[PDB]
Design goal:
The structure is cut from a larger assembly and holds 1 copy of chain A (88 residues), 2 copies of chain B, 1 copy of chain C (63 residues) and 3 copies of chain D (285 residues). By secondary structure, chain C is mostly helical. Chain C has 3 helices and no strands. Helices cover 62% and strands 0% of the residues of chain D. Classes of the chains: A mainly alpha (88), B mainly alpha (272), C mainly alpha (63), D mainly alpha (285). The interface between A and G is small, with 3 and 4 residues. Chain B: Belongs to the herpesviridae major capsid protein family.
């Protein structure tokens, strides 16, 4: 629902083609006709609102903890988190 | 000196041109005045193949390094009317070049058709390329990313000898102007170095057991960093007895294989 | 004027023998103008001798 | 600091000194645009060596004068952002067909800032202008480029044929002498145009001005070093031909690198202070 | 350092050996016997202690 | 480009153009303010036809320098836009006697924005200041006037008369000439005043500035558009009298309306270029 | 601007009055630095009462010129904050051997602020450059003193000693005269430097400029006031001997203490407006 907006409709086909299949416990499963709707729209609003009010509550050190950690110590968990952090 | 020489500001040199400020600046650690052209990596590797594999294996740690005082030597040999006055007998020409240079050029380099002056003046033309005095340089290099994994703060000390010569034996006539400087695991011979300083000759004559070439007579405290060197005692243990054979020359190269994890993964694929 | 600077450089510093005339030596005849400029750094007389030595070698290098 | 030359009489020496004192105020600041000044070197009149040497001194003193003036862009670079911020507040109230599409352009316009390097400076000038002209065209409902990878060319909007032909003479005359610009008597404002359009037009003008100054300056700067190596490579061939004390002295001066115009400064200062010694190597008269 | 290298040898004090200098003189069959006093320094192949 | 006057000697034409080229530097930038310039036209000395034509040339050229200099308070406008936003963060924290009565003024303050039309800006600041200058009165629990039809005279609160007199003479000197604003040395904040009130004053200052410049500019332009229309209205009468080819030619040049200053610039650009053909119409000396 | 003197010859008064208008232009801006001007004052040509009074006029007028040429660092002082934030812009990205120590220096660099009052900045600069250079050395891994109570000297990093001479000579010519600024010392090399050092050196030069000007003005005022307050005491003790009206008028003027910025400027006007009347007391010629 979040990716659907702000993306070209052809890109959305490629994403939904894979977001629907789930390999939990070695079995695969597929969501039956997942469709963007109003029922997802109100949840889009509540998720973007809570997730944006989260951004304006973390302390100066709470956000900085990862930078502080990677500059001093490294492990496998930290490698992928260095990736999701885009650039620096 | 006490601070790294990285700043490109501190390095420059001028050749073929009058540099009185540089010539006076001799004997100063500061601006080292390094020649323009830098060694390409491939011949940089050949230098390490030669001085670090070939020479210690063919000399068995008998070699030693030493610098010449050019300031008082070149002014001593040259600076005679015979060389200041140059156009664009056999003994009367000996006087012209002097007793100091006659010992060097008389038999070593002169043909029956080239007089002593026509031979020794060819030497004079190399005076225009003179560089600084002998000086030692430290090289504080951290190890590569494949090896700096454990102990990241390690930094490898080196003690290369800028502007120096390898020395098979003590110079007989330049003995007034030579400067013995043992610095390396090899190139630290007591027999050469004691011939050039009473300070080291008394040291060895009180301590005869340091005469030994194998594990050197203890180098200066500046130069005695056994653990931070790249090449530790087994290298001189090996070069001390190894037969001066080509395969005993190559085997130092096989002693030089790194213990990187990438060195291990690469070396093992070869079935070495 | 400067003729005294040139004599002071030829004799106090370079200590050239009287047989080495300033007029005779052209490669010295040009360098005197340059050594006169560097009025400092006259304390080390061993540098100017080797500099003039290498300039004389500059004078006669065919290669 | 004083330049030196070999063959020329003091009249032409003073002519070049005056040519160099008045460089910024001279139109067409390009030595290759003044062939008579290079003829002043006395080509075909003096020896090949002296011609080459007075030319090398001309190029070295010219490049040194370029570095000496070195056109600063501090005030216009800040005026460009001050001008840029205007279009955002002019466009907020305006109604668009798809306000999100234009909010993207206002956001591209409002995050504009200049990196310390002079290299990245021209790119912001172009990205903001692409974001602004497209905005002004959405303001007029005019056709927009749609093909992938295609972009609207930066061009003034709703301005007369004579008026753009007139401002382009100015923007071109910036290229031939960057250090000084004369602001147009004509003002880009129009009573018929929307205020956003006028702000966009003034923004495009400052952007094209910054781009014309930057590109021409870097072009001259690299061209000077190209001619300098061109000269030193030939001059060494000339000096090798006749060995003597002084001919062999200039070669040992020329052995050094030519890159990095501070190195050209080094070569010029070492070449001047040691001029007295090799002046006789070059034939004159 | 080059100039003052004779100054080091004026002191007649004998210089104590490092450990890995003392570690080499053992034969390959005697390196493992208890008489080796440097056995605890060989903790790890890739890192000398 | 080259203004053309019939019976005016170069001593006076040079004066008339020197009056224009330095207009940003003179106090009291009004053509009527300087009556000597109106006398340089040759009125009561030249014939009426030539008198009206020289007055008309002066008015078109003065209007042109107005359109050219064209004040643009953007750099101050953004500072005003920031200070208004700070005023609400100050007014929200400070306890009020009436939570809801001040809610109206604070929401009015949140709604400020600058319309795509420049002309609306002076209104916005006005509705901005009624939003604030009243509110600060509630800040001190002062009893502000509530009689209908008077709103609230704009005024600085809790300030020295020495300071308000100086700031008033500053706003007046900006009022007469709006281009070379002189930066103040005054520090409008006072530690004695409430922290909110220092912000209200630093807001009201820039608000008065933007209002005064926009009002004075519109006031000059609204007058010149009447002046040129009067000059053409009187000059077409004089030109009707002569049937000479050039006398009909000038009436055809005057046919176009002077409204929309763009036409005031077009008429001048045209009236210069064809000056040679009809100059025969007007008597000389 | 209406200075007068008692016994000086008119040609000598010309040089002293012209010294006011050419003050800032010349090097060595200090009244003692020019002894000729003080021999011009009238020692041994005029009586002691005339000499001590003449020096009052010169010192009050010199203090007046110094305040007219009010040295105004705020234009450069704003740019210092741009350069300092630009230094932190690279302190974060740059890797260090130990970062948890340099983080303290980056935080301490973020602290720097400019008070509207001048007198504290010569402290803040020192708090920054020491924190900045301790950073910059760690860029190139310079050996750092650990001995407690030691401050690293403030010096340019990786700038050639001949370059450092040329830049510190300009700083010394700044300490000679705060009004004249020649930031023409830009020879830094593109290749020879690293990302931090390129900006650390320019920040150090701007901080040395700001502090040198602040200290130079402070020295000038410190000497001016102590000199004026002593000349007033000498003259007041001098006129006590006379009884005649014209002399007592002077003591009645000089009772007022000169200690203030505004009090010397009030005393000089009050001592100038009433010059016609008390000049009789001081013997002249």
């Amino acid at each position: 629902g979040l990716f659907s907006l702000d993306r070209s409709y052809e890109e959305v086909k490629a994403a939904v083609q894979q977001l629907q299949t789930i390999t939990f416990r070695d079995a695969t499963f597929t969501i039956p006709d997942p469709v963007i709707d109003q029922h997802l729209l109100i949840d889009m609003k509540t998720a973007c609102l809570s997730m944006s009010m989260v951004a304006n509550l973390a302390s100066e050190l709470t956000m900085t903890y990862v930078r502080k950690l990677a500059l001093e110590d490294s492990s496998m968990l930290l490698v992928k988190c260095q990736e999701l952090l885009m650039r620096l | 000196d006490r601070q790294p020489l990285n700043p490109a500001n501190i390095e420059a040199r001028h050749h073929g041109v009058s540099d009185v400020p540089r010539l006076g600046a001799m004997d100063a650690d500061e601006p080292l005045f390094v020649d323009d052209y830098r060694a390409t990596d491939d011949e940089w590797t050949l230098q390490k193949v030669f001085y670090l594999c070939l020479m210690p294996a063919m000399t068995n740690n008998r070699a030693c390094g030493l610098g010449l005082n050019l300031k008082t030597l070149l002014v001593d040999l040259f600076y005679r009317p015979a060389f200041l006055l140059m156009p664009a007998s056999i003994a009367a020409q000996r006087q012209a070049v002097g007793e100091m240079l006659t010992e060097l050029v008389e038999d070593v380099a002169t043909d029956a058709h080239t007089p002593l002056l026509q031979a020794c003046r060819e030497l004079f033309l190399a005076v225009q390329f003179v560089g600084e005095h002998v000086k030692v340089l430290e090289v504080r290099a951290p190890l590569d990313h494949a090896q700096r994994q454990g102990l990241p703060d390690f930094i490898s000390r080196q003690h290369v000898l800028y502007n120096g010569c390898c020395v098979v034996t003590a110079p007989k006539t330049l003995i007034e102007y030579s400067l013995p400087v043992p610095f390396h695991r090899f190139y630290s011979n007591p027999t050469i170095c004691a011939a050039l300083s009473d300070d080291i000759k008394r040291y060895v004559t009180e301590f005869p057991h340091y005469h030994r070439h194998d594990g050197g007579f203890p180098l200066p405290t500046a130069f005695a960093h056994e653990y931070h060197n790249w090449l530790r005692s087994p290298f001189s243990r090996y070069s001390a007895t190894c037969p001066n054979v080509l395969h005993s020359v190559m085997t130092l190269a096989a002693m030089l294989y790194k213990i990187s994890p990438v060195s291990l993964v690469l070396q093992t694929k070869a079935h070495i | 004027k400067r003729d005294e600077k040139h004599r002071h450089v030829v004799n106090v510093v370079l200590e050239l023998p009287t047989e080495i005339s300033e007029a005779t030596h052209p490669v010295l005849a040009t360098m005197l103008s340059k050594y006169t400029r560097m009025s400092s750094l006259f304390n080390d007389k061993c540098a100017f001798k080797l500099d003039l030595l290498r300039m004389v070698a500059v004078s006669r290098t065919r290669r | 600091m004083s330049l030196q030359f070999i063959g020329l009489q003091r009249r032409d020496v003073v002519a070049l000194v005056n040519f160099l004192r008045h460089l910024t105020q001279k139109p067409d600041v390009d030595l290759e645009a003044h062939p008579k000044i290079l003829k002043k070197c006395g080509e075909k009149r003096l020896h090949r060596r002296t011609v080459l040497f007075n030319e090398l001194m001309l190029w070295l003193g010219y490049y040194r004068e370029l570095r000496f003036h070195n056109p600063d862009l501090s005030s216009v670079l800040e005026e460009f952002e001050v001008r840029c911020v205007a279009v955002a507040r002019r466009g907020y109230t305006y109604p668009f067909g798809d306000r999100g599409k234009a909010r993207d352009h206002l956001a591209v316009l409002d995050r504009t800032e200049f990196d310390t390097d002079v290299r990245h400076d021209a790119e912001i000038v172009e990205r903001a202008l692409v974001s602004a002209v497209i905005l002004a065209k959405m303001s007029v409902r005019e056709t927009l480029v749609t093909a992938i990878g295609q972009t609207e060319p930066i061009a003034f909007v709703h301005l007369k044929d004579t008026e753009v032909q007139r401002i382009e003479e100015n923007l071109e005359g910036v290229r031939r002498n960057m250090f000084c610009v004369k602001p147009l008597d004509l003002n880009l404002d129009r009573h018929a145009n929307t205020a956003l359009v006028n702000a966009v037009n003034k923004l495009v003008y400052t952007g094209r001005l910054i781009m014309n100054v930057r590109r021409s300056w870097e072009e001259l700067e690299r061209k000077c070093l190209a001619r300098i190596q061109e000269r030193c490579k030939l001059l060494v061939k000339e000096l090798r031909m006749c060995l003597s004390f002084d001919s062999n002295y200039c070669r040992n001066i020329l052995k050094h690198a030519v890159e990095n115009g501070d190195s050209a400064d080094t070569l010029l200062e070492l070449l001047i202070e040691d001029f007295d010694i090799y002046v006789d190597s070059f034939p004159q008269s | 350092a080059a100039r003052r290298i004779p100054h080091f040898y004026r002191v007649r004090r004998e210089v104590p050996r490092t450990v890995n200098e003392m570690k080499q003189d053992f034969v390959v069959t005697d390196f493992y016997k208890v008489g080796n006093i440097t056995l605890y320094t060989e903790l790890h192949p890739f890192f000398d202690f």
